Amino acid sequence: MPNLLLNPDIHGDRIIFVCCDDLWEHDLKSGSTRKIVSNLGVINNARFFPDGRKIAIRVMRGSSLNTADLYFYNGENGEIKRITYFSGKSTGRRMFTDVAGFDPDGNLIISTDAMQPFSSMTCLYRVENDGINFVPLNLGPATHILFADGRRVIGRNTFELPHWKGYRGGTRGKIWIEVNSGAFKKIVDMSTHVSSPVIVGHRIYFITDIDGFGQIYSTDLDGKDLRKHTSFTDYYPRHLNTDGRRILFSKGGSIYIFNPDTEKIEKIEIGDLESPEDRIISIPSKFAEDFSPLDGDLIAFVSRGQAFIQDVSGTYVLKVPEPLRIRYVRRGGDTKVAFIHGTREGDFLGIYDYRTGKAEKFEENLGNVFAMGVDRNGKFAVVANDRFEIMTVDLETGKPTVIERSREAMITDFTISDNSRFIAYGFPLKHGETDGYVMQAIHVYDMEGRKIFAATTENSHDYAPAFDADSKNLYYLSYRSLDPSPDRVVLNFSFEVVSKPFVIPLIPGSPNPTKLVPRSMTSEAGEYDLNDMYKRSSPINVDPGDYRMIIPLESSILIYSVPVHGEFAAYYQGAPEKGVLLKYDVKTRKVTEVKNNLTDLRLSADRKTVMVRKDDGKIYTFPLEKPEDERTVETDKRPLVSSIHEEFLQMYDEAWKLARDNYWNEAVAKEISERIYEKYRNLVPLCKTRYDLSNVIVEMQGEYRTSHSYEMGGTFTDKDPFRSGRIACDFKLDGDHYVVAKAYAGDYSNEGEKSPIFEYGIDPTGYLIEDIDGETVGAGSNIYRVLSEKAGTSARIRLSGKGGDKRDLMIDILDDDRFIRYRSWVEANRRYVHERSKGTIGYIHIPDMGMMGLNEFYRLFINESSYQGLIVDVRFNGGGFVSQLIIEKLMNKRIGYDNPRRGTLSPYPTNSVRGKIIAITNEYAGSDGDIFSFSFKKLGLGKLIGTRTWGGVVGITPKRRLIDGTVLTQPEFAFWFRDAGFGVENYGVDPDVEIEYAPHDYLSGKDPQIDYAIDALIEELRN
Amino acid sequence: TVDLETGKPTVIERSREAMITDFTISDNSRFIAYGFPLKHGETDGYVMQAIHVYDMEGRKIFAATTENSHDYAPAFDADSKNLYYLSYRSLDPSPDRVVLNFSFEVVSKPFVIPLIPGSPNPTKLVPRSMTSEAGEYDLNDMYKRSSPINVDPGDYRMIIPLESSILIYSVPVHGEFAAYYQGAPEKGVLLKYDVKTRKVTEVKNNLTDLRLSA
Amino acid sequence: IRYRSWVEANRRYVHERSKGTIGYIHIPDMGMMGLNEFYRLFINESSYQGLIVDVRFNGGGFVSQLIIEKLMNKRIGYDNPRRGTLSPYPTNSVRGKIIAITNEYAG
């Protein structure tokens, strides 16, 4: 049972590497191997100091390794010590805040975005007094820094990219070298991405796959004389490191050595190192998914691929006797439950009787199932798959029978009448093949006659069908009640509250029950007739809102409603959508609130029990009769039991299967998938930790050589995330005191855009921080750490300014201050542009193409669009999908004005730019950022300035998570530009005018991209 | 200001964009806070609005807030120590349910500004023993001391600061058809914000207009 | 009811006469009703080879600019999914040729 070895470093005969998230050292001389540091969290990088005594270590924390910081290790005494309290943000693909290199004097130089407004701005800092002080190098963003003959060698974006092999986009690793104690010149800029640079002698060795596979290469300190030193074919090599004589690296889970003076390569022998307990315990709630109420007040729920039948208290629990991957569980009868079991071949329907214990499992493959339901009479089930089919599965035999197939999207919204005769479901459709909107009409299937009827027309979005208990009327919801709501900031309108319920009597001549038409005056007593039933449709007199479910009851109707809300929290913090359960009294037509703070709701088969999840993440249950008597469903009374290796195999196979099933190109997916399966599967048994599996899974994802192949979430550690104490200030260790070097502020009047000290009416800049909460900080006291320990609370800060100017304030210590830095930056650039253009040019920055991008764009657009010129800076733009909505605004051509009796002119359109526009972009703008960039040029909105962009334009829409919560993404939607095809993918967008931002530009404190933008517009504005 | 004794009117300030109808007078009759419409450019498509404060003593005008958005409904607390007001600065988009679109529906939030530098936002409940106030009036750079009050963003039309609570008039998001073709009035509700428990509650609904005693 | 009936009649007519190759949208005014009707049909009629934008009898108002903006969107890309159909970029763009109809009652 060998281990997966990776990320090595060497110094003489000693070699340190990572195994089971812990750091190990191996001695070539004796062949001995030992663990020198552990239990710190997941370690992904370790770097020997010059002397080969101390070791800089990067360790990640937070269940999803969302945070990171650096530690020192002194091999002499075995002392460990945290050096940075930045709590840097990191992701698999972008594992920022690391060791950048060491200076001649042996000082550690780190790369971090911790104090920058943008994550890609991983600036270089020289560590001092072990974290007490940080000195900026001002060489701009950089991943590696080397020193050759007193010359600084800069590696930009030179980290490894295992998730995207063959990458040739604008963000590809490049190398620069100093030529004149400040003058820099780019020396290595190949077609492909260059990573892990090192210097042995007078040559730079790095990795690249310019030839189709990862190999080590090298060139002189001028980038000339290229040479290929390896010919690997099994697994890409990674993480180059050296001591000055030999080069170390990992491959296929093993450590190799490359001697440049011999060009000889050999695998170091390590063998078994650690095999932890395979059987692990987990908190069922942590991975809980799918919670459904059963007869007898029992509960069923899925967690980590396992299923359980339990009482609400969680005292009596039954595990479903079925191997890994149960996707869904559903009431199938008195004591029976149907479930969906997922394997590598696909999804299958199964049944389990928890009373007798029997549990048959059909072998008919249903495809990839995304919805499942059983009729009240336990005769058949209804299932939806990714083939866009809706079908019934005979619970007796197992024979699936397709009712209908949509060619636009999945048919997951359905319901079965109580007499098991009809099936109503939303049927996605389009009027035209290239239509920008997918409509949805409700369809009804009659088991007798086996014919499909149209419950509704196909002009909008109809959903949430529901039959009444008697099976006489079909209720459902629609977004057909068009009525606009005004925007409070921008001249705009949207449909916020246009949802309304409707009903359809299954017996013609029968009226809308909620209309309360006297029975004596209605001559019903007809029979079922679903023909032209969409013509009998009728609404129910309920105020329009945003409804997600309707449940018709005897003398009332329950409706789930979601108040209008912003999307920022849900978009960047996973914040759940808050709903409320309403009750509509059919007789009095009065509406009331039955339960709030809900995030999800399920209803019993007999409509008597209600199960819900609230905003606190907990699950509750209450009788529909007395909603005041709800109980909390306890699930953690019993530990979840599983096998690391069984899960790892299962997860790998699922990841591999998703990667294949969702890749945008089916043909390609066939060859790529089959050609990489076994190769990466062989490494799975060597994985003992989640982080191990990650290394394997991402590498197999890279095989698709496409963008947007990510791995998010998941549980890698149980260590609490690193914390960081921030007050939006920059400290400088001057003498033996810290002085506020800079006090950040954007718009003083907005929320959260300045240092909390400003609220006391003073600018902290220039003041000295005497102490925090009675503790002296300065020369012998790391202010970053002290703040670290007060994050999230208020601490008394003692400040000293000009003369006897002493202040004693309770300051809020933020957990983060990135946004404050960001807005400060934007307002700085905005002031700068107004001053350099003499008030003739506006400025707008777009951070991403998501909700934040929409906020920032308008935040300035409403004040900067009416200058003679306008700069639209989209540098560092994280992408998303709103580029089209922004381009639309910029596209507005001003063709008129409004002349008032009093006041000033009003431009028409209101949302139009007044003059010339100029766009600025760089290699850190990507995806929807690439699209916006290409678009700006294509529509001729203006000139594009900067450097070629990222190049990743194959979008994603994940719809599955691994049994551990992990969310993998698959490039499923290839963007095609007319007159460019898919060309932008793996290339990016070239600017009209290329303006590099070299390291010496940063040393001079000048932004060449923005200056050119200004100068250029000024030149264009002379007419 | 018009001297109620003689009748002599005295112009404080003039906007060149729109009327200055949103204003308030502190209880000690010393300051006058009002929304001042302005534009960055003459042909600008949007009119901004910043709150201005006029000091009867010194007869000088100060900038209570920056001019990057829409600030309104100024209100002084009875003690005349803090200036409360509202803003549409809390940008956060809401999705359209039919068309690929987004708009700013709930981006209104209240803010406060202490008239005495060094004094904290009263609703922050900073222990008095830990705050060294006891200063004097200083309206310079007061927009820098601005602070928000911890209330969920919404669509507020008025804020009334009271002793241990704050009243706020809120208007739920609604369609415009009825108001546009049937003169249908805008329905609001009067909310109460308890400064101590930070809990909000409904005081009165189905409101279309509200006035408050002296 | 008479109005929407009229609109659907003209809409059916245009689809039949162009043999399913031309869409139809009517804008009654430039107020809230106009915004409703424009989108009510825009989301289903914008992807035909051609599109007729009938603004006859349009009572005016002020949202002409917001509608013109939608019609100004030029389609320059597409989205290719593993399953399903193409998605146009921008989403709110007309696919083909546009033709406008107006009379002395549009003002």
Binding site: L491, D898 | D155, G188, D209 | M30, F62, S64
Partner: peptide
């Protein structure tokens, strides 16, 4: 009446 009763120019 309110502080958001929009007043735009009608045509």
């Amino acid at each position: 009446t309110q502080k958001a009763a929009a007043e735009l120019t009608f045509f």
